[PDB]
Amino acid sequence: PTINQLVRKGREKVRKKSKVPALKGAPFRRGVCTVVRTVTPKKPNSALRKVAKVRLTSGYEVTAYIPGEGHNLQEHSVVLIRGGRVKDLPGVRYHIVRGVYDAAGVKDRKKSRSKYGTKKPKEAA
Amino acid sequence: MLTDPIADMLTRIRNATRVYKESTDVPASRFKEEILRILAREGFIKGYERVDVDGKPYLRVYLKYGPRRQGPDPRPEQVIHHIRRISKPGRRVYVGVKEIPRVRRGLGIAILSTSKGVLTDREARKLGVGGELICEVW
RNA sequence: CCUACGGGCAGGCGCCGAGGGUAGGGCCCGUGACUGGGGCGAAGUCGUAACAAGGUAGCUGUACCGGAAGGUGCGGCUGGAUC
RNA sequence: AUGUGGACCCGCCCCUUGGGGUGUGUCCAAAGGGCUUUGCCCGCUUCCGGAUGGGCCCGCGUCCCAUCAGCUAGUUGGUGGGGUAAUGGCCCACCAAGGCGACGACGGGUAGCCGGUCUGAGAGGAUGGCCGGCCACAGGGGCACUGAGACACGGGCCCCACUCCUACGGGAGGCAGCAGUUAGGAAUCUUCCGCAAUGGGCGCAAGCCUGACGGAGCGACGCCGCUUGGAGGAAGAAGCCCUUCGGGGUGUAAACUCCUGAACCCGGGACGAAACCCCCGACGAGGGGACUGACGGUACCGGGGUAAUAGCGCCGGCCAACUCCGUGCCAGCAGCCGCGGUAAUACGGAGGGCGCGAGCGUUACCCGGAUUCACUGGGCGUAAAGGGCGUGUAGGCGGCCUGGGGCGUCCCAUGUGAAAGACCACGGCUCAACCGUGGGGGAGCGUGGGAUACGCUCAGGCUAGACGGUGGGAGAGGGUGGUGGAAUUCCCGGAGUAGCGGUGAAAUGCGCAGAUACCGGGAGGAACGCCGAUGGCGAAGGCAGCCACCUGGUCCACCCGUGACGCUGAGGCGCGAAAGCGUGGGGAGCAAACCGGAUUAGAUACCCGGGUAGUCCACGCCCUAAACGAUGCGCGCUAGGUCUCUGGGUCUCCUGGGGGCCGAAGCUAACGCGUUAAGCGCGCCGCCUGGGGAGUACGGCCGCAAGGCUGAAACUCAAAGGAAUUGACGGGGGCCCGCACAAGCGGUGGAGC
Numbered sequence A: 001p002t003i004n005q006l007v008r009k010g011r012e013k014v015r016k017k018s019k020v021p022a023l024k025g026a027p028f029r030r031g032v033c034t035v036v037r038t039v040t041p042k043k044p045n046s047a048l049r050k051v052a053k054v055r056l057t058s059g060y061e062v063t064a065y066i067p068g069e070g071h072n073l074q075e076h077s078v079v080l081i082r083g084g085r086v087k088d089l090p091g092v093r094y095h096i097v098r099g100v101y102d103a104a105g106v107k108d109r110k111k112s113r114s115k116y117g118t119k120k121p122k123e124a125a
Numbered sequence B: 001m002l003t004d005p006i007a008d009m010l011t012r013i014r015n016a017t018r019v020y021k022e023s024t025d026v027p028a029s030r031f032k033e034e035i036l037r038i039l040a041r042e043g044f045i046k047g048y049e050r051v052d053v054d055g056k057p058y059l060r061v062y063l064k065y066g067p068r069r070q071g072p073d074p075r076p077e078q079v080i081h082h083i084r085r086i087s088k089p090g091r092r093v094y095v096g097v098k099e100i101p102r103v104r105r106g107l108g109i110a111i112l113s114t115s116k117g118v119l120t121d122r123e124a125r126k127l128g129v130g131g132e133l134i135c136e137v138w
Numbered sequence C: 001c002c003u004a005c006g007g008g009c010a011g012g013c014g015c016c017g018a019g020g021g022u023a024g025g026g027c028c029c030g031u032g033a034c035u036g037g038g039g040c041g042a043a044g045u046c047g048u049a050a051c052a053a054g055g056u057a058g059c060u061g062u063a064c065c066g067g068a069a070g071g072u073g074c075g076g077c078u079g080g081a082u083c
Numbered sequence D: 001a002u003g004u005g006g007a008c009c010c011g012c013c014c015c016u017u018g019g020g021g022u023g024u025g026u027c028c029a030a031a032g033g034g035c036u037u038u039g040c041c042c043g044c045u046u047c048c049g050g051a052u053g054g055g056c057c058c059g060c061g062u063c064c065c066a067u068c069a070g071c072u073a074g075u076u077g078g079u080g081g082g083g084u085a086a087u088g089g090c091c092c093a094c095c096a097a098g099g100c101g102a103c104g105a106c107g108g109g110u111a112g113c114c115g116g117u118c119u120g121a122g123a124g125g126a127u128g129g130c131c132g133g134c135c136a137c138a139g140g141g142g143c144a145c146u147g148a149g150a151c152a153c154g155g156g157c158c159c160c161a162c163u164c165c166u167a168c169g170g171g172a173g174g175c176a177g178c179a180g181u182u183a184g185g186a187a188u189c190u191u192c193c194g195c196a197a198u199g200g201g202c203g204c205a206a207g208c209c210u211g212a213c214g215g216a217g218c219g220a221c222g223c224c225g226c227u228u229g230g231a232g233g234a235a236g237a238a239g240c241c242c243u244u245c246g247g248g249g250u251g252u253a254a255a256c257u258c259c260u261g262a263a264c265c266c267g268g269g270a271c272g273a274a275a276c277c278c279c280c281g282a283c284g285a286g287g288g289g290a291c292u293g294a295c296g297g298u299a300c301c302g303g304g305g306u307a308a309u310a311g312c313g314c315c316g317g318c319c320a321a322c323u324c325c326g327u328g329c330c331a332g333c334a335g336c337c338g339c340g341g342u343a344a345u346a347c348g349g350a351g352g353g354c355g356c357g358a359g360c361g362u363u364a365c366c367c368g369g370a371u372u373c374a375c376u377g378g379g380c381g382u383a384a385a386g387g388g389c390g391u392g393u394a395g396g397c398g399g400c401c402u403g404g405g406g407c408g409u410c411c412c413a414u415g416u417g418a419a420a421g422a423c424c425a426c427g428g429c430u431c432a433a434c435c436g437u438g439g440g441g442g443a444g445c446g447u448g449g450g451a452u453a454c455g456c457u458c459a460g461g462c463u464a465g466a467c468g469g470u471g472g473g474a475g476a477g478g479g480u481g482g483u484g485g486a487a488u489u490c491c492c493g494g495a496g497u498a499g500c501g502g503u504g505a506a507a508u509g510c511g512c513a514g515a516u517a518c519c520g521g522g523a524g525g526a527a528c529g530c531c532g533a534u535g536g537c538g539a540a541g542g543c544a545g546c547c548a549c550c551u552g553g554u555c556c557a558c559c560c561g562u563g564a565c566g567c568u569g570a571g572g573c574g575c576g577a578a579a580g581c582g583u584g585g586g587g588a589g590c591a592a593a594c595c596g597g598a599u600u601a602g603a604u605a606c607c608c609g610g611g612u613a614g615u616c617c618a619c620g621c622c623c624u625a626a627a628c629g630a631u632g633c634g635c636g637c638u639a640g641g642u643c644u645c646u647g648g649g650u651c652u653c654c655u656g657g658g659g660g661c662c663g664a665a666g667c668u669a670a671c672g673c674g675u676u677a678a679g680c681g682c683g684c685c686g687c688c689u690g691g692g693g694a695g696u697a698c699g700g701c702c703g704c705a706a707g708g709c710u711g712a713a714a715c716u717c718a719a720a721g722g723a724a725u726u727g728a729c730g731g732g733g734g735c736c737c738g739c740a741c742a743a744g745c746g747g748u749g750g751a752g753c
Ligand SMILES: NC[C@@H]1O[C@H](O[C@H]2[C@@H](O)[C@H](O[C@@H]3[C@@H](O)[C@H](N)C[C@H](N)[C@H]3O[C@H]3O[C@H](CO)[C@@H](O)[C@H](O)[C@H]3N)O[C@@H]2CO)[C@H](N)[C@@H](O)[C@@H]1O
Pocket: C041, C044
């Protein structure tokens, strides 16, 4: 646009939209499981994906993914949520953090252990 | 009505040179003449002169090019590779002497209007002045 | 009440006054019987509108009609193929 | 009472907002205490000056929403008061009718501001946590008192809410001081030591107070520094992993050999502290003297001395690092692309490898990349994007010559830009982190001086822009009235007879109340064939028989006039195809809806037969569009060729205005554009900022209604797009083949086998 036009109107700064009301941006939010269901993916994937509907302190009831080999979560479970969509599961915008509150960490996990939250094993160590 | 005669002049030059014209007339103005003087002194043009076209004051302006070139397209290199208004009616640009720019590491000019007359960057920097940043030519 | 008789103090009235009440206006959230569509989700149902002249060229403003895509009127466009 | 002085009224000088001075008149001071006691020490009074700190005012700057457009009645100004330290509608009486607003008032949202911080090549973007500066607050709301200073966190009053006491009458309380507890939360410390230092209050001093402060405690929370060893050490142990069974890997890595010696033990042991005070001198300068350490038995120095912690992420591509097993669209991974369906470098484990290392990853948030809001630095013919077109307000922009002013602009000098932080030196802790000193920058704003090219401004001039005059032109530009012929329908008459109509084929339908076809007459409605164009006119929409009247634009020639009078144009105002609406006419033909006939699996369609609104006129609405050149307006500049409409000339040819085609330079993603630019430039406007949700919801405005203008969000996708390429396909085209069909002769399908 002309200069006179920029002077009259100016440019508009672009507001960035949050992908995540773990409400106030706050890196983690604690909640209570409600339904611990299994959901099928979409698009070109097939599996039985493990999921918690979570009541939060933040007020929101949201659905979260339970990552890892297998889990120990039932209907009143109390867990920490972290954010991280799942992408094959629509409306699943958060993961549960394993190793915190009533989500025990993944047993038998040798490799990327600190996600999944499983302490150092002790046979050759 | 012609909003910027200097931009006009410059553009007449830009255009005539791109088809290797020997000359262009441009309606005459004292200010225009002063810019040409610089232009001529710095060896961008051959030179210029007052003339009447339908009995009205012009400035014929003798353009100047490289030699013929070799392969396909033997059109001459251009002396005025680039010529370009800066300050304009829509938006005047004024500089202090500390912020007069170095045009193409000095292989290029900037013409520049000051209270000690129209000057190139070097002339004006040594003369310790600034003013309206008219155009840059390389 | 005190007084050096000048006045002072108590006390009383009044204006303003946080806040309260009543009637009328506005605005912001909640919650909601009942209701309208929307997104998204490998393999459900009806047709086949569109893409090749898509088998009625298409698209379009508008107006009516119709399970549905749609069809028809009028006017426009070519962003229609065939000579 | 004294009055050095000061205050007030009046006057007079100087000065200029209430600043100095001066003359009558009036009015105003004081406090004592201590002595190593006649002369000192602490105080007291009035006045002037300084220093510090503040109050008030002003220019400029300081976020989002215009889906907040009008706001104001102490409002705006005035006269006179009150109140203050002081100006002021700060408050009050009276008077006037004012003040503010698209340069965004009013309203709503959100937020303490700044020095700085983070980011970024910069411009910019984000931010205001530590430290310093200012503001504001002290459970919520008001208020004043005291005082130099408060409307006062640990003062007072009242009202409200909550907690505690209560003999039910009444009271008490205020950690956003230091700790600390509890609640909330993903999450944030000790109810520590000390006044030794620095600073602060009172005190003549000694001292007293000081959760300011100096320290220590706790958290890898961050930054920096350091350790988990060093040198030898095999053609190379074992174990584990590959393997083409030969070999390869982990790997000098280990074991082992020398060497050093974090931790830990022994010893010494701080700097921070010289003043206050006392003595000499004089209670001054100077000199002498004594006390004082929380940190801390710490830092640091010296002697001895043990081989003494390693983890986390990653290895499909972006990206540094590959193999075996397990698994079989499962379990799972996943930042995006995407992995997984029996040979998965992508899942899980192993070996091996890469990267960082007392850390490594994760999530969240800011800037970056993102030239993806583009000032630097983008775009709008077909990708998102030119407003449907005009008229024109505010605004933006403005041809050539001369002179004046010097507002912008440029220059010099000067004040300011605190400290910290930032940059560079040199220093202090063994280094660094941290810190001391010094230097250097630094936008912006103030004052004084100067320049005058360009911009602005004032005055003067010009004629190239613009407008005008004279004469000549082409045109479906518009409005009103009139008028012409062809055709369709209907009505009347004649003649005429069995069908007409309609389709792929039909039927519905019309026809013996005589249709169709044919001639003659009449009525009406609507539209104008040839001319007609690849044509013309209009700003767009859009305009077509002929005539007249009224009227808008525009082109050429003369170069006669005015003298920059110009361009663009938010908003406003007007125009604005069709359909639609209102009132009233009109209605031939056509024809949504609708009534029928076909077709079809069905056919709410395509085909046929009917047919109302409507299509027509007037007046008033509506205001949309593929309102398209999908191309904003104006101006200048940059080869030509060719065809066409319309002027002028010396009429072979030249020169204007307009419509096309091909094409220089050039531009374009390409297609294409190309003196009728999409080329090169200037001015001004409108618009875009991934797709879907959605031109939806909400709000406002408009409308009789239909609806129109303005126009989101949640959620959700990794595309949605444009142009061009190769194919493939077509119930597209052209050319052509084959026992492909046609032309033939014999078969199969029937029967038995
Ligand atoms: N897609 C959203 C919108 O609504 C519709 O889309 C939705 C449905 O119409 C459509 O339904 C289709 C159906 O038409 C088609 N013939 C059969 C198909 N199974 C259905 O599929 C749908 O439903 C199945 C479950 O039955 C889901 O597994 C699947 O996600 C979804 N595609 O799938 C869409 C799921 O959102 C319209 N197609 C379209 O107008 C528009 O895009």
